[PDB]
């Protein structure tokens, strides 16, 4: 009985922990989007200025 | 000074088209990782329910 409530304890442990660890690791995916979004927004603005220079 | 920026507005041109391969990579890199979360949310999903 010992034994089991031991591992019942580890298993929703381990359960909690790998709830917030994909939560987390969803979060930063989105964070990691939204600059490489505004790196590719500026970028283009770039490329524009780029296509003018062809004319300079 | 003219081959100077003939030179340089080749170069810059080709790191434009290089960066743009690695950012077209990323994209990729972006797809397979939306894919990924996919998967994991519906077999995450299967083992929960």
């Known amino acids: 009985s010992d034994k089991l409530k031991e591992a019942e304890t580890r298993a929703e ?3 909690r922990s790998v709830t917030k ?3 987390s690791i ?6 990691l ?3 490489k979004l505004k790196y590719k927004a500026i970028s283009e ?5 780029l296509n003018d220079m062809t004319s300079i | 000074v003219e081959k100077d920026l003939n030179e ?3 170069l810059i041109e080709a790191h434009f088209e290089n ?3 690695e950012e077209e990579e990323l994209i990729s890199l972006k797809d ?3 894919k990924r979360r996919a998967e994991r949310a519906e077999q995450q999903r299967i083992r929960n329910e």
Do not use: P, S
């Open chain 2, 32 to 34: 397979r990782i939306e």
């Open chain 1, 45 to 49: 603005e770039l490329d524009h200025a």
């Open chain 1, 21 to 23: 660890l994909e939560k």
């Open chain 1, 26 to 31: 969803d979060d930063l995916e989105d964070e």
């Open chain 2, 19 to 21: 960066r743009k391969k």
């Open chain 1, 33 to 35: 989007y939204a600059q």
């Open chain 2, 8 to 10: 340089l507005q080749t």
């Open chain 1, 13 to 15: 442990f381990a359960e």
